[PDB]
């Protein structure tokens, strides 16, 4: 149970915040878990997903498929993955949106900022796990 | 249309009372707010007592209450002089001063003088500048014991005592109490008429 008097356990408030969150907050909301191997490799559990990452679908009708994430449609709270597509009536091809919480990251797109973020998360995890 | 045996109605609801309505849904909130204010004041003025100034001992005005005592606004100038404290010293030491109250009886003056003396005995005075203590200033191991007092300073005691059993005396038994009371009433009632009769006799 929450103890912070300034954190609301109101379902309506939670839903309103979730569905009106700005882009930078939707970035945090659209987080995906690392696979077991990558988790042991990097020391972190989950990270805000990013374009050009590599993931594997863990649930749904496309479970088991792998590919690179093309777009993070934050407005629609979904990510488009490479090769995860269907055909419209006319024949054109459309990517199927997948919620990042239902995939697992297999490889991180790392740059200066992403490396710094992963280092921060790993250090914090080490600290808290040592304390626990 | 009241019917049968009833108590005649008396409700005062003929005004537009819906415009003036007061609810008490914030009573616990007000309680918590006042507790928080007391805590903040205690932190601000520590180690001084939270209650604030010391108050005097008083007798309730009317004869319906004059057998009781309660806390007063402060100490009279006569009381301060008897206890050997200046008004300015009392102000800086944290003693309430009642500039309006005046003493007309030795017992009432002495009760508050004793209260002031006891407070002065219990008082702990910190150095004005911590480095250099002065005269009248409390000692270091005394200052180490200083703690904030909560509630009224020198709270009064409202316990009732019973007089010790004694022997009934013949002088006590021989008095006519009812006749004495009636005699006092008659004397007070007829004082003026007797004075008028005496004046008329003197003129004659």
């Amino acid at each position: 149970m929450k103890v912070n008097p300034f954190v609301s356990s109101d379902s309506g408030k939670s839903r309103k915040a979730h569905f009106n969150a700005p882009s930078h907050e939707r970035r945090r909301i659209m987080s995906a878990p690392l696979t077991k191997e990558l988790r042991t490799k990097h020391g972190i559990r989950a990270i805000p997903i990013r374009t050009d990452d590599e993931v594997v679908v863990m649930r749904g009708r496309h479970k088991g498929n792998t590919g690179r994430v093309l777009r993070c449609y934050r407005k629609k709270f979904v990510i488009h993955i490479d090769k995860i597509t269907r055909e419209k009536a006319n024949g054109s091809t459309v990517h199927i949106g997948i919620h990042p919480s239902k995939v697992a990251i297999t490889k991180l797109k790392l740059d200066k900022d992403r490396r710094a973020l992963v280092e921060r998360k790993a250090a914090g995890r080490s600290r808290v796990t040592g304390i626990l | 249309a009241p019917r049968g045996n009833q108590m005649l109605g008396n409700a005062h609801f003929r005004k537009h009372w819906h415009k003036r309505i007061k609810t008490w849904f914030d009573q616990p909130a007000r309680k918590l707010r006042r507790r928080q204010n007391r805590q903040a004041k205690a932190v601000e003025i520590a180690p001084r007592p939270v209650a604030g100034l010391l108050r005097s001992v008083v007798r309730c005005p009317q004869k319906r209450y004059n057998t009781k005592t309660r806390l007063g606004r402060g100490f009279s100038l006569q009381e301060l002089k008897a206890a050997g404290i200046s008004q300015a010293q009392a102000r800086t030491i944290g003693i309430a001063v009642d500039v309006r109250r005046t003493n007309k009886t030795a017992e009432g003056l002495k009760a508050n003088a004793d209260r002031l003396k006891e407070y002065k005995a219990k008082l702990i005075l910190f150095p004005k500048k911590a480095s250099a203590p002065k005269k009248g200033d409390s000692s270091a191991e005394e200052l180490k014991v200083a703690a904030q007092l909560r509630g009224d300073v020198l709270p009064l005691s409202h316990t009732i005592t019973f007089d010790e059993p004694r022997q009934v005396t013949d002088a006590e038994r021989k008095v006519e109490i009812f006749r004495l009371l009636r005699k006092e009433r008659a004397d007070k009632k007829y004082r003026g008429k007797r004075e008028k009769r005496a004046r008329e006799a003197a003129e004659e």
Binding site: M1, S9, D10, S11 | H18, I21, T23
Partner: protein, 289 residues
């Protein structure tokens, strides 16, 4: 809770009167919108004020006698010591060692829900927590929409005497409450107003019980000025024992049956045997005839 004092009364509505072939309800004024000419104000009208709008100054809270509160708390505590009442209230106490269940003061030293769960499981109180887990469900009705999404069973209540911050070990276990013996809550001792909550007493709380609630001697309580355990109006509360006691058996008279009535009136004038049974001389008279 209350409705807005001006709800349904924000229209400059007037009645059309008679002669217009419509009901005399007040109607919205103006034109050019569908609202114009529609009924207003009345509780029968769409958009009007409800009947007797609920007011905010209703009698929400109650004054409860302190003596009756203490009586209720004591009765709940006493009922917690009856295994049958716990089963009736639905607690699983099949393998519980004893009722009341007193436990060593070490439980007050717990700091981890792992420790608490191990203690419960070894004490055989995990059946109640599993029943709570199975009992969690969706609440039926509008309560779901009002931050009351789920309904689930209540588990045991651990009562401690000297808090070594032991409640932390128990907070996260569903259905398990924690209380301090000094301030015992009737709302948690008898949830739903029903007797027989399952209580885990620590040694300190069990020892302090007498100090707090006193005994049957008047003014025996020290932390409740003038309070003492109430006396019963019936000494022996089992109705069959008195009935079958030797004194009552001696006084009682032997049981009887329902009185028997003839029920059916037959026709001796038409029959022979009945008439002769009632009047044997009739047979002699007929013989003479």
């Amino acid at each position: 809770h209350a409705v807005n004092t001006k709800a349904g009364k924000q229209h400059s509505a007037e009645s059309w009167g008679t002669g217009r072939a419509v009901a005399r309800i007040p109607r919205v004024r103006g034109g050019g919108t569908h609202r114009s000419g529609q009924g207003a104000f009345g509780n029968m009208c769409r958009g009007g004020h409800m009947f007797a709008p609920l007011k905010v100054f209703r009698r929400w809270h109650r004054n409860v006698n302190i003596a009756q509160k203490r009586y209720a708390v004591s009765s709940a505590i006493a009922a917690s010591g009856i295994p049958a009442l716990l089963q009736a209230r639905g607690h699983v106490i099949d393998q519980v060692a004893e009722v009341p269940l007193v436990v060593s003061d070490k439980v007050e030293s717990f700091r981890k829900t792992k420790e608490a769960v191990v203690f419960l499981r070894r004490s055989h109180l995990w059946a109640d927590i599993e029943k709570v887990y199975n009992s969690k469900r969706n609440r039926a009705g509008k309560g779901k929409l009002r931050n009351r999404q789920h309904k689930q069973k209540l588990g045991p209540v651990v009562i401690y005497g000297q808090d070594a911050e032991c409640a932390r070990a128990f907070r996260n276990i569903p259905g398990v409450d924690v209380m301090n013996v000094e301030r015992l809550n009737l709302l948690k001792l008898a949830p739903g107003g029903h007797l027989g909550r399952l209580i885990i007493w620590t040694e300190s709380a069990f020892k302090k019980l007498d100090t707090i609630y006193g005994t049957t001697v008047a003014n025996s309580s020290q932390l409740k000025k003038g309070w003492s355990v109430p006396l019963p109006i019936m000494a022996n509360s089992d109705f069959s024992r008195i009935i079958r006691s030797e004194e009552v058996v001696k006084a009682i008279r032997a049981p009887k049956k329902n009185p028997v009535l003839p029920k059916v009136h037959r026709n001796p004038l038409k029959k022979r045997t009945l008439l002769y049974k009632l009047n044997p001389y009739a047979s002699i008279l007929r013989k003479a005839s």
